[PDB]
Write a protein that binds this ligand. Structure first.
Ligand SMILES: O=C(O)[C@H]1O[C@@H](O[C@H]2[C@H](O)[C@H](O)[C@H](O[C@H]3[C@H](O)[C@H](O)[C@H](O[C@H]4[C@H](O)[C@H](O)[C@H](O)O[C@@H]4C(=O)O)O[C@@H]3C(=O)O)O[C@@H]2C(=O)O)[C@@H](O)[C@@H](O)[C@@H]1O
Ligand SMILES: O=C(O)[C@H]1O[C@@H](O[C@H]2[C@H](O)[C@H](O)[C@H](O[C@H]3[C@H](O)[C@H](O)[C@H](O[C@H]4[C@H](O)[C@H](O)[C@H](O)O[C@@H]4C(=O)O)O[C@@H]3C(=O)O)O[C@@H]2C(=O)O)[C@@H](O)[C@@H](O)[C@@H]1O
Lengths: 380, 380
């Protein structure tokens, strides 16, 4: 039985079982994944401190990014204050190295940790640990356990919690560190430092003003907040809190966001309405990967107001078959392949064979190096 | 006004009205002077400020990534890259000269124009500093070629498509004519830049990449000639400008415009309204130069009788209502581009509907966008 973590544990356990029994199809698949993983073994571990422009704290270990839809105002002499263009990503975001480096770290750590769990080969735990130590716990290179300056906006007067959503990029890596416990490379001291960092990060996200505000967000930010929360809580083995968060925060939030026809009105007012409708459910999907490991199914458990997350999947399903039929603003193309994992997850949780069949028909590329697809041989 | 890449009529009128002390223009130039202060302070940029070197190992070689080419996730190393028309690969921002050519071009153009209008030596001093560093400096100046522009990892054959990047610094080249005669731009400076532009002119006319780009069947071929005219006008080659116009630009226009005035090579793109407009922007900037020696590219026919104004007529209804556009346009079209374009084509054609619409669309009075400096007429 796989340790509690941010992944479909049923698929992960099955891949490990089949691999240990030498089943040929799974062994060929994992051998491919191991070739894909070679670049992560050699990759130099990344650090949030690898930036020149420092945050207002003057601390390179503070994570800082630009909120992506905020641009300089050319009618202002210094371009300040920035103005918002919903759905139009300002390429200035790439001047903050931790934006993409958190992605690269998260991919590397997730891939290596999962491969260690499946294959038991110490080389994957050793490399996973090198990435985790550098990003999280190292006294010079590790990030401070906060998100004070995530998605800052030049010229903005008020403090915001919106940047907290960036945390999903490294909180999955945090969760996967559970898979390398017991390896030779991940020492009792390593685990203790990471536990303390995760405890400090959990305190910040629950008690800071930005964390409190983000926990109250009425749209996909509130769902992603709790999906990240669960990752941290599961890493810390706080199973009672996971139930409380599922029952007292996620399900009420999910219930308040679903209209009578199943649409997500908060996401429908966005310029990328099909993207953000899907993004909201992806938060619930990743949350459910964790809650369901302790017996709570977020796809089929109704909220206090009678709304159930399956209703939102039902509304969006025809538009995953034909994204061109989408009638609300979507100023960029929608990546239909996102529906593969989503419909498989919701389909399996709901016993809806039509969703699962469509999930497989859309499918994922057998040889893709996208690390989030590693558990989904069933879709390849 | 000296021969260069700008609406000479608008520039002369601004200088004349500034020198007369006309109130409305004087206020406007004063605002442009406050906008230009950041370029006085700005450290000059160099193509050599990169870590990943081009295959020549020469940091003075300009190198960028062709914007629509992406790693193939189904390949272990992502090679060869694959094309996704209209989807810019954020990897392009890892090549510093992509955005640095734009920032240099903006600084040199704004300072040169403000020197021409005001006669204030501080603007030529700063303009010269940017020009020397980018173009002629024996260590920081770029080599006069575009061999590695828009390279594509894994691609076997060389291409000339990256040449279109040159428009970002070739407008700065031509604006150097505005600072000749100042105290800061010495006879030595001018000779070095003349020699560079002659070597760049040789490379773009005789290299295989330049030859191939000169025969491209779409907006690349038009942009190639607009760039060609900036270089030739900087070198005062007025007879070559006439030849290029008659033997290259007009035949391309006659081939690329369909009987109904549409641009079929641009209609097959995923950003078909953007690239139709981009084609006409190439003709627009070409015409700004040719009309200074008596050649109107908006109304001079090709040998088959077609005129570029037919392409304007075709797109005009969609500049009024971009939502009516019927071909693939996977990102929104910025309507404000129609302002300068319709004003240029409108005045060159005596079409008062075009000019009025251009004023109705308008430009922001206080915008810092440097291409809009000559267009006070659009800012009322
Ligand atoms: O590129 C990325 O980092 C990822 O972006 C992901 O989408 C996030 C963004 O990162 C931002 O955080 C963005 O924040 C939004 C809020 O969700 C919200 O819409 C907010 O709207 C305000 C608005 O600022 C204004 O004050 C107005 O008057 O009121 C609005 C309101 O109350 O609704 O604006 C924020 C903003 O843009 O700053 O939102 C999304 C999100 O998750 O909703 C995601 O696209 C991911 O795939 C990217 O990788
Ligand atoms: O750099 C920017 O962001 C600016 O880009 C401007 O658009 C340019 C691009 O930079 C590229 O150079 C792009 O090149 C295109 C060609 O125009 C052409 O479509 C070519 O088509 C081939 C294709 O490569 C492929 O082999 C296919 O099977 O056959 C095609 C064919 O010829 O039929 O593909 C090139 C490519 O994508 O590499 O094109 C544009 C352009 O000017 O057309 C511009 O968008 C600007 O606003 C940006 O700032």
């Amino acid at each position: 039985s796989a340790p509690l973590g941010p992944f479909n544990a049923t698929l992960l356990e099955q891949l490990k079982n089949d691999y240990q029994k030498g089943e040929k199809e799974v062994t060929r698949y994992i051998e491919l994944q191991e070739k894909v993983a070679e670049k992560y073994i050699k990759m130099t571990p990344l650090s949030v401190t690898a930036k020149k422009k420092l945050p207002p704290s003057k601390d390179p270990r503070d994570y800082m990014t630009l909120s992506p839809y905020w641009w300089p105002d050319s009618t202002k002499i210094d371009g300040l204050p920035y103005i918002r263009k919903d759905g139009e990503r300002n390429p200035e975001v790439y001047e903050y190295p931790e934006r993409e480096n958190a992605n690269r770290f998260g991919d590397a750590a997730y891939c290596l940790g999962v491969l260690y769990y499946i294959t038991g080969k110490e080389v994957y735990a050793k490399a996973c640990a090198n990435h985790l130590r550098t990003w999280f716990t190292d006294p010079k290179l590790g990030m401070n356990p906060n998100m004070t300056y995530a998605q800052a906006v030049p010229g903005m007067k008020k403090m915001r919690g919106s940047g907290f959503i960036d945390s999903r990029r490294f909180s999955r890596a945090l969760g996967v560190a559970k898979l390398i416990e017991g390896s030779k490379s991940w020492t009792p001291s390593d685990k203790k430092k990471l536990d303390d960092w995760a405890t400090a990060f959990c305190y910040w996200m629950e008690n800071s003003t930005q964390g409190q505000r983000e926990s109250h967000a009425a749209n996909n930010h509130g769902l992603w907040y709790e999906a990240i929360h669960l990752m941290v809580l599961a890493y810390l083995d706080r199973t009672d809190r996971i139930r409380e968060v599922a029952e007292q925060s996620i399900l009420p939030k999910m219930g308040a966001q679903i209209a009578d026809d199943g649409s997500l009105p908060q996401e429908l007012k966005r310029t990328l309405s099909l993207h953000y409708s899907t993004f909201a459910l992806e938060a619930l999907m990743e949350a459910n990967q964790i809650t369901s490991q302790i017996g709570i199914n977020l796809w089929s458990t109704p909220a206090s107001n009678g709304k159930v997350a399956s209703q939102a999947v039902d509304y969006l399903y025809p538009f995953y078959l034909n994204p061109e039929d989408w009638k609300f603003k979507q100023i960029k193309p929608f990546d239909q392949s996102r529906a593969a994992i989503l419909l498989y997850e919701a389909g399996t949780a709901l016993g809806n064979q039509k969703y699962v069949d469509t999930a497989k028909r859309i499918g994922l590329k057998y040889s893709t190096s996208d690390v989030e697809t590693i558990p989904y041989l069933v879709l390849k």
